Amino acid sequence: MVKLILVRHAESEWNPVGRYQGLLDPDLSERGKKQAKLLAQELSREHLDVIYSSPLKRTYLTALEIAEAKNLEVIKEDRIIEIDHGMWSGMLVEEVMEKYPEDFRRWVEEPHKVEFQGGESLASVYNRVKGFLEEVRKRHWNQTVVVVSHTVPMRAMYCALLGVDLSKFWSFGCDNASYSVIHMEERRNVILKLNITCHLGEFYVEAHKAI
Amino acid sequence: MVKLILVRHAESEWNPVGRYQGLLDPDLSERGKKQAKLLAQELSREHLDVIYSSPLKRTYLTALEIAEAKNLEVIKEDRIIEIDHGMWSGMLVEEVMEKYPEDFRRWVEEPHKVEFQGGESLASVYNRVKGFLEEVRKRHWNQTVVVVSHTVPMRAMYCALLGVDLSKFWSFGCDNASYSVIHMEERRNVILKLNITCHLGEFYVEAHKAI
Numbered sequence A, B: 001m002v003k004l005i006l007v008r009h010a011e012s013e014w015n016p017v018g019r020y021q022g023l024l025d026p027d028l029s030e031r032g033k034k035q036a037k038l039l040a041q042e043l044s045r046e047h048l049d050v051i052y053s054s055p056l057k058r059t060y061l062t063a064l065e066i067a068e069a070k071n072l073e074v075i076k077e078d079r080i081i082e083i084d085h086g087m088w089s090g091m092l093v094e095e096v097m098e099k100y101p102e103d104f105r106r107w108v109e110e111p112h113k114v115e116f117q118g119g120e121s122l123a124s125v126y127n128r129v130k131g132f133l134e135e136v137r138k139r140h141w142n143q144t145v146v147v148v149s150h151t152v153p154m155r156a157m158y159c160a161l162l163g164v165d166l167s168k169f170w171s172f173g174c175d176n177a178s179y180s181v182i183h184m185e186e187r188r189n190v191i192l193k194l195n196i197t198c199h200l201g202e203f204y205v206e207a208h209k210a211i
Ligand SMILES: [Cl-]
Pocket: A015, A021, A150, A151, A211
C-alpha cells in the first residue's frame, strides 16, 4: 500500500486576512514558520520515503522543513499547485463577495461547476491531482509519501481518492500545517486520519470559510 | 449548525484479539478504561449540550467518562448500536476468513450488499443511523452533540453525512476512543476532523482490519 500523508502548507502572510492567493506567491507568516517546524517534528517520528510539494513558497518552505528533518530532497510538483483563482487573485473574501456575488455563490454552493475567469476550473484541478495520485500509487507502492499542497487541490484529491463526486469538495477540513493520513490499498483508498493539527498547540488556526 | 462529535468506544476486551462482537456485550479492557478517561479529558475542555450512546457497555462506559464532570445524562440510543454480526459474533477474524470465505470477501469488497446470517444487513444500519442523524440535525441545531458508537454504524454515518454511496463504507478511519468533528451546516455536512487520537498517547491502539 501507499501511506500518503497529505499536508496543507503552513500559514502564509495572506491567510489571516483571507486574501485569495492562487498562483501568487507570498511568504509564510511568522506563525506559519513556527507551524512548519512543529509539523516537521511530528512527521520526523516516522519513516518518510519521498516528499512532493507544490512549487510555491508557502508549500515549498513547509516541505523543506519536513525534508530537512529527514535528509530528503523535495520534489517540486506542478500537478499539486494551487488553483489559478484568476481575477480573484489578490482580493479579500469580502471584496469578492461584494464585486462578484454570483460567482462567489457558485463557488460556495456548486464548486464543481466553477471556472475562474482568467484562471482555472475546479474540474481541471481534479484532473491534474488525480493523474498525480494515480502515478504515485504505481510508483510508490510500499512507501510513505508526503504531499504538500493547498486547500483546493487537496479537497479535489479527497474526492478523487474516495471516488466521489467533485461536488463534495467542501466537505473536508483543511487547516494550515495539518496532515491527513490516507492508505492507498489494493481495492480502495482509506482516509485513516483527516486534518490533524494536534502538533500545532497554541499555533493552531482554524481555516477561513470559502478558502 | 450542529457540531457533531462522533466517538468510537474505548477498547473492549475483545478488540486486541480481533473477535467479532456484534450485539455481545464485553467490558472495556484496562487499556480501554484509561482511553475513555483520556478522551473525556480532551472533550471536557469544551461545551457539550448532549451525549448519545449505544447502550452496549463498551460505548456506554466511554460516554459516562465524557459526561462526568460535565454533569450531563447519557442518552441511550438504539439506532447507533453495533451491527448484529449474527453467526460471526464470537469468532476471530481469521476464523471467519477460513469458515465463511465468500461472505468475508463480500464484507471487505462490497460491504453495502452484506446481510449477516442470523444478524443484520449493512443497509439496515445505514437506514437507522441516517434517521438518527436527520433527527439530530432538526433537534440539536446550534448545539454540540456527542455520539458514542461503533465502527460499523459510524462508517455508515460518514456515508450518510457526505451523501455518498454506502459502498464507500471502508474509507474512514475509526480507532478506539477517537473522535471526529463534523459540522452539520445549512447546505452540507463537513468532516472537519476525522479519527483524532492524539489524546491517547501511549494508550493508542490501531484498529484491526475487517472490523
Ligand atoms: Cl490558502
